[PDB]
């Protein structure tokens, strides 16, 4: 599914991301924009052979199992394919674990380079939330 911007904001809010670990909703929307262009089916292979999955590009190195990332962990205890569903529940639950883990949203490289310090509120402007 390709979410609309306000559509995604609403789903994220409903699933308790808004201000989770102090990150406002626009942070999460902005991260999703630049990670996946709001596409739940997005996949990208990393140089190390790990793969990033879903709306938030959660990496199989640590967070989900894909059967093909040697040495990796599955700290969200999910198949990586669950991160590609039209329903964002598994993605959000796993994101919550990731952002709690010490580096906050810096774990998302596109967040750090494209969202951090910017006017992230723009991402939820005009949404009925
Ligand atoms: Cl915001
Ligand atoms: Cl694996
Ligand atoms: Cl933080
Ligand atoms: Na893994
Ligand atoms: Pt939820």
- Phi, psi (5° rounding) for residue 2? -100, 105
Q: Which domain holds residue 127?
A: 1-129
Cα-Cα-Cα-Cα dihedral sign, residues 114, 119, 97, 82: negative
Distance in Å, CA 118 to ligand 4 centroid: 32
Q: How far apart are CA 11 and CA 89, in angstroms?
A: 9
Tokens 């990033």 belong to which residue? 52
Q: Confirm or deny that 101 is annotated as ligand binding.
A: yes
Token pair 């199992």: residue: 65
**Catalytic annotation, residues:** 35, 52
Task: Quickly tell me which residue has 């009925």 as its tokens.
Answer: 128
Give residue 51 CA to ligand 1 midpoint distance, Å: 28
Taking the C-alpha atoms of residue 36 and residue 73, their distance in angstroms, rounded to an integer, is 22
Alpha-carbon span 56 to 124, nearest angstrom: 17
Beta carbons within 8 Å of 124's beta carbon, 6+ residues apart: 6, 9, 25, 26, 29
Q: Tell me which method was used to determine the 3D structure.
A: X-ray
The tally of domains found in the chain comes to 1
Q: Rounded to the nearest whole angstrom, what is the distance from the C-alpha of residue 85 to the centroid of ligand 3?
A: 27
Helix, strand or coil for residue 50?
A: coil
For the stretch 116-119, contacts whose Cβ atoms lie closer than 8 Å and that sit 24 or more positions apart, written own/partner, are 118/30
Nearest to 63 by CA among 41, 44, 80: 80
Domain CATH for 53: 1.10.530.10
Resolution of this model in Å is 1.8
Give the number of residues written for the chain.
129
Q: Are 127 and 3 in contact (CB under 8 A)?
A: no
């Amino acid at each position: 599914k390709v979410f609309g911007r306000c559509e995604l904001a609403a789903a994220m809010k409903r699933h308790g991301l808004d201000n989770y670990r102090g990150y406002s909703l626009g942070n999460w929307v902005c991260a999703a924009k630049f990670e996946s262009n709001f596409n739940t089916q997005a996949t990208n292979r990393n140089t190390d052979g790990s793969t990033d999955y879903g709306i938030l590009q959660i990496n199989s190195r640590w967070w989900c199992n894909d059967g093909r990332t040697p040495g990796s962990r599955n700290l969200c205890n999910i198949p990586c394919s669950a991160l590609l569903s039209s329903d964002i529940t598994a993605s959000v639950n796993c994101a919550k674990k990731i952002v709690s883990d010490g580096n906050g949203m810096n774990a998302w490289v596109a967040w750090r380079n494209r969202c951090k310090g910017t006017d992230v509120q723009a991402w939820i402007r005009g949404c009925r939330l």
